[PDB]
Structure formats: structure tokens, C-alpha cells
Design a protein around this ligand. Structure first.
Ligand code: 8DG
Ligand code: MG
Ligand code: MG
Ligand code: NA
Length: 329
DNA sequence: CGGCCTACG
DNA sequence: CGTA
DNA sequence: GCCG
């Protein structure tokens, strides 16, 4: 009994079907590059089902009945099991379009629509973009400037150092405010593309205006290479992280939430991306409730659920609780 | 057939 | 659009 | 692409 929504089953970080899931994820990414979010989602959901299975799939038979496996995903698996390669996957992954779209969308500040326009204009390399700086937003200029460092995996030692400097700035900005590591590192990942932190204060309302004060204190300590900055509560930053004898750029996301919303923000920002999309879809389509990073809303009674923990949210949705390390959908 | 997560910057 |  |  494989449940159909990813939020209904545990997905560990280490799983048993990486060859098959990787192939489906290439097809998902290619679907996104061609503007089909629906096909992207199906291929991601199928890949995720494989990550939740207890053992390796060795025979096509083992897919029977699994949700999100239809004719196309099944054929991909069948070719991989019988030949060790899937022609369609190889054609996609070796194509100029796929490789260029992947290169460009991996830049901070560049998504599919921007990458597709550049591709249609004949651009193919990072050097091509550097030569045409007037095509770039300031966010994209920062992403390109720091691209090599941003392609280096962030490690747990980096997380620990960043948490210390963020806690220092937060404490200087508002006594009693707290910093919680979220994102993939909270799910047990050993590396990441960035570090995500959620900031609050135990007294509702005290955190208003906090994030500009934090950003100013980090900027004055020379720690900020790029940020968007009158009020704001999320910052998608690039930090200058000291290293032995030098420094490296690291993407850091900072989000401030009132404490009433903390469990919802913690749940949302802990991910994974697919886990949260599936949880929000489940909430609305199966329970008639609207979930976001601020709350859980009953649109008929026009009321918000008062959760004290992530556990409370799962319970109000009729779901078995999953700890962060089982949300790796 | 239409849906496919979410809200902030 | 970007965060993604 | 798959599903409700
Ligand atoms: N990347 C991404 N995150 C999303 C989306 N929707 C959504 O609610 N989120 C939430 C869940 C993610 O765990 C959380 C933090 O995002 P992230 O991009 O830093 O990803 P991550 O920490 O899980 O993984 P990573 O940084 O190692 O790559 O944001 C979405 O479409 N993409
Ligand atoms: Mg992250
Ligand atoms: Mg992030
Ligand atoms: Na990008």
C-alpha cells in the first residue's frame, strides 16, 4: 500500500532506487524546461515513490499498482532494468537545449522563462552572459559573479559557522530572538546549496522590523555580498563566509515569522519542496483546508488552526507525523 | 476534461 | 518575473 | 503524465 501523496509516507534521505529516480528526475527537469509543470510533477512524484520503497526495484512487476506510474514512467523503468539505459533519457540529457537550460537555471536569479529567452537568443555559456551584462538583473549579476563558489556544496562546518554569525546579529538586533536551522540540513542532509534559517521571538509582535536590523548588522560586519536591500521578512542573501586565510560566497536564506506562525513556517521551510507541495495539495483537496507557511485556514468557518508544533499540524490534517528526516520526498 | 503549492521580494 |  |  503505497499512498498516493508524498506527505502520507516516510521518505528517508538514503534510499534504494537512485538509478531509476535519477532518470525520472531528468525527464521531470526537461518537462519544466519545456513549460509543462504537470509532466514535471508526475515525473517527480514517480521518482519520489521509488525513494519510499523498501528495496530496489529489479523487475517491472514490482511497479504494478504504484501511484504515478503509467505507460511513460513504466517504460522508462523497463528500459533501465532491461538495458541499463533509457534512450529518451540519454537523448534529453545529452541535448544542447537541456544542458544549456540546466546551466542557466542553476544561476541564482535565473528561472526557466529567463533561461529559455536567452537560449532562443543564441546564448549558450556563462561567458556569453558575462559579455552581455545589460541583459542581467542585479540579482542575476550577483548569481553570476559568485557562481563558482555557489556551485561548491555547503558543508555542516559552514552551517555551524553561519549559524553562529546569524545568532550574533539576531541577538544584537533584538534580545531574546531565536535562530532555527531549517531547510535540507534540518532533514539530515550532509550538504546543501544554501543554508536556511528561521528567526522569531517568543513575544508576539516583537519581531516586527527585525530582518532589516539583522541585515544591517551583518552588512556592517562585512558578511553580506548581496541582498535585495521598506519592510521585509524574507531575504535571499549571499554571504562572504570567512575561511582559513580567505573567504567563500554562500547562499543564505533568512526568514522572520511571528511566534504564532512558527510551526507553520518551520514546516514549510523544512521541505522538501515536493513534500510541501504534496502536503498543501493534500490539505486542500482531501481536507478542504488551505495550508501555507503562515497557517492552516478553514475557508468555510474562516478560522485559523492554532498549532503549537509541527505535530499538531499533521494531526489536524489526519496524517501520521513524519520527522524532518522522513520528509525527503 | 482541468488540476497540478505557496507567498513574499 | 525571481526566490525555486 | 497521471489522476480525480
Ligand atoms: N526549492 C524549493 N523550495 C520550496 C518550494 N516550495 C516550497 O515551499 N519550498 C520550501 C521547501 C524547501 O525545503 C525550503 C528551503 O528551500 P531550499 O531551496 O533551500 O531547499 P533545501 O534546503 O530543501 O535543499 P538545498 O538547499 O540543499 O538544495 O523551501 C519550491 O518550489 N522550491
Ligand atoms: Mg536550503
Ligand atoms: Mg533556501
Ligand atoms: Na535559478
Amino acid at each position: 500500500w503505497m499512498p498516493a501523496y508524498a506527505c502520507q509516507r516516510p521518505t528517508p534521505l538514503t534510499h534504494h532506487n537512485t538509478g531509476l529516480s535519477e532518470a525520472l528526475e531528468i525527464l521531470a527537469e526537461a518537462a519544466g524546461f519545456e513549460g509543462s509543470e504537470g509532466r514535471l510533477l508526475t515525473f517527480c512524484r514517480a521518482a519520489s515513490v521509488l525513494k519510499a520503497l523498501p528495496s530496489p526495484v529489479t523487475t517491472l512487476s514490482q511497479l504494478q499498482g504504484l501511484p504515478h506510474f503509467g505507460e511513460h514512467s513504466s517504460r522508462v523503468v523497463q528500459e533501465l532494468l532491461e538495458h541499463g539505459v533509457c534512450e529518451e533519457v540519454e537523448r534529453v540529457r545529452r541535448s544542447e537545449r537541456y544542458q544549456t537550460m540546466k546551466l542557466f537555471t542553476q544561476i541564482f536569479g535565473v528561472g526557466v522563462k529567463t533561461a529559455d529567452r536567452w537560449y532562443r537568443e543564441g546564448l549558450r555559456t556563462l561567458d556569453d552572459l558575462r559579455e552581455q551584462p545589460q541583459k542581467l538583473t542585479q540579482q542575476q549579476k550577483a548569481g553570476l559573479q559568485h557562481h563558482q563558489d555557489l556551485s561548491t556544496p555547503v558543508l555542516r562546518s559552514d552551517v555551524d559557522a553561519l549559524q553562529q554569525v546569524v545568532e550574533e546579529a539576531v541577538g544584537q538586533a533584538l534580545p531574546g530572538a531565536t535562530v532555527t536551522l531549517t531547510g535540507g540540513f534540518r532533514r539530515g542532509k550532509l550538504q546543501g546549496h544554501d543554508v536556511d534559517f528561521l528567526i522569531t521571538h517568543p513575544k508576539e509582535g516583537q519581531e516586527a522590523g527585525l530582518l532589516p536590523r539583522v541585515m544591517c548588522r551583518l552588512q556592517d560586519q562585512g558578511l553580506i555580498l548581496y541582498h535585495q536591500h521598506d519592510a521585509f521578512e524574507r531575504s535571499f542573501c549571499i554571504f562572504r563566509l570567512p575561511q582559513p586565510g580567505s573567504w567563500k560566497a554562500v547562499r543564505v536564506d533568512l526568514v522572520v515569522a511571528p511566534v504564532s506562525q512558527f510551526p507553520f513556517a518551520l514546516l514549510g521551510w523544512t521541505g522538501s519542496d515536493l513534500f510541501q507541495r504534496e502536503l498543501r495539495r493534500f490539505s486542500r483537496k482531501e481536507k478542504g483546508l488551505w495550508l501555507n507557511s503562515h497557517g492552516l485556514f478553514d475557508p468555510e468557518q474562516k478560522t485559523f488552526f492554532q498549532a503549537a508544533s509541527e505535530e499538531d499540524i499533521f494531526r489536524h490534517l489526519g496524517l501520521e507525523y513524519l520527522p524532518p528526516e522522513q520528509r525527503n520526498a
